[PDB]
């Protein structure tokens with residue numbers, strides 16, 4: 001997509017060499033923002049084939065409040081295998097914080113239900129927020145949440161959402177993150193009877209790994225195709241009752257997929 | 265400042281009318297980012313006089329972990345009076361979350377000390393984060409944290425910082441927020457022996473209140489002056505041992521101050 005390749009090129013032109021946790025090395029910039037008007041089409045990258053099955057099931061998994069990879073395996077999704085322990089557990093990552101953030105006084109707060117209540121009863125609120133960044137449980141998480149914090153906003157009958165992502169693998173992770181949150185905005189808007197507005201992505205350490213350079217040069221030689229359209233076929237009773245089969249991505253005609261290793 | 269007046273004008277040109285919590289009404293945009301290179305000068309607005317005393321003492325107060333306004337009063341700072349209860353308390357807002365985030369298992373985490381340790385031992389880390397957004401204590405806070413989440417980044421010997429601000433009063437609050445975080449970056453860099461890099465500000469609901477319009481038009485008619493320079497006169501033993509007297513802002517020559525009411 002145009003915004004996405006512009007970011008790739010910016011990182012190549014302006015990124016500084018940085019060592020990283022994984023020992024791979026990156027080119028890195030700090031602080032970037034882009035905006036996707038969801039009415040223009042579903043922001044799924046077309047200059048390489050993205051695996052929609054993994055994208056959709058990962059989100060349905062977050063929404064169940066699940067942090068064990070068994071559900072993903074049952075559905076032949078293997079994107080989280082490297083970080084799971086021997087029991088398939090990741091610790092209280094995304095889904096657990098979204099659905100059941102534990103309090104000091106022994107309560108569990110379901111942030112997704114709170115948001116739905118705010119959207120339905122106080123849409124002008126400037127506090128419609130979900131955070132995965134639970135300081136008190138970081139030490140138990142397999143990986144600290146990279147997409148850490150997001151905010152909804154309603155104006156003129158449209159639902160917008162901004163994500164803060166502290167750390168972004170531009171080549172592997174970012175195409176998934178964009179499509180994942182665009183999907184959630186479409187689901188939330190359907191449930192609240194709103195139109196889709198903008199998805200605003202904000203990055204902290206936004207980087208290309210040093211062993212993704214050939215792949216990046218390949219992809220940058222490709223022309224983007226027209227964006228596909230997202231069709232939701234059914235309106236479930238709640239945000240927690242969506243199924244893989246409810247989504248149809250129409251007119252997705254990507255360039256070939258590009259293999260790249262993940263930095264563990 | 266140039267970036268700051270450009271934002272003001274953008275909100276006037278592109279903002280949509282939105283009702284708000286306070287009942288005042290705003291013009292609002294969603295999602296904005298600007299960058300201040302701290303080597304260019306200290307980003308204190310010059311097209312109106314800013315009260316540095318309130319700015320500096322509020323930060324020293326956050327860093328003590330204090331949430332009662334008595335310290336501010338002792339120093340003739342009245343910016344938090346409207347939201348305090350009868351005992352002068354605000355509940356577990358900024359300072360408490362920064363210094364003593366309470367965990368489920370009964371611990372208190374000092375996020376500022378953790379950050380200092382990360383900067384000193386793992387500067388390439390993509391997880392150098394402080395969050396005030398403690399979901400489990402929101403119901404006890406006088407106002408939910410508007411400057412909610414920030415991240416440090418080190419590259420090439422320079423310290424950068426990005427703030428996510430969920431809600432931004434462009435006229436009254438923003439000049440304070442910019443200068444407040446620029447100050448903390450200078451303090452942190454001094455303590456860690458780094459140079460200052462960029463302060464990146466990211467906003468969610470970024471708005472002008474309807475009863476700030478005359479004031480906004482006045483300020484937009486003014487030419488920005490050269491930025492002042494921040495001098496820190498002493499290197500204290502720790503980040504918690506700074507005093508008001510340690511800071512000197514040299515060459516600050518603002519246009520006159522502009523009175524505006526705060527929306528409660």
Ligand SMILES: C#CCN(Cc1ccc2[nH]c(N)nc(=O)c2c1)c1ccc(C(=O)N[C@@H](CCC(=O)O)C(=O)O)cc1
Nearest residue numbers: 051054079169172173174176177258259260262263264
């Ligand atoms: C973001 C996110 C979720 N995640 C979780 C996740 C966990 C650790 C990470 N670590 C690093 N260094 N980068 C990542 O983006 C990353 C992502 C993903 C992890 C891997 C793939 C991946 O390897 N995708 C390949 C192959 C897909 C397949 O066919 O199975 C691809 O080509 O896209 C995608 C998403």
Ligand SMILES: C#CCN(Cc1ccc2[nH]c(N)nc(=O)c2c1)c1ccc(C(=O)N[C@@H](CCC(=O)O)C(=O)O)cc1
Nearest residue numbers: 315318343433436437438440441522523524526527528
């Ligand atoms: C951000 C922040 C911290 N805060 C906390 C705070 C709390 C609630 C708020 N509520 C609203 N609606 N806008 C604000 O920006 C705001 C700010 C501030 C609050 C008030 C002033 C203020 O009235 N400043 C005046 C007068 C200063 C003086 O002389 O005492 C000014 O002209 O700047 C500044 C900062």
Ligand SMILES: Cc1cn([C@H]2C[C@H](O)[C@@H](COP(=O)(O)O)O2)c(=O)[nH]c1=O
Nearest residue numbers: 021144146147167168169173174177390
């Ligand atoms: C889970 C996840 C990881 N990542 C990448 C960012 C980093 O390169 C890496 C996480 O490593 P880090 O914790 O050291 O930042 O995984 C994404 O880009 N998006 C994601 O959703």
Ligand SMILES: Cc1cn([C@H]2C[C@H](O)[C@@H](COP(=O)(O)O)O2)c(=O)[nH]c1=O
Nearest residue numbers: 126285408410411431432433437438441
């Ligand atoms: C504390 C604080 C408030 N504000 C403003 C943003 C909003 O206009 C208002 C908070 O109200 P809200 O919780 O309804 O967003 O105060 C700032 O801009 N900066 C700050 O640091």
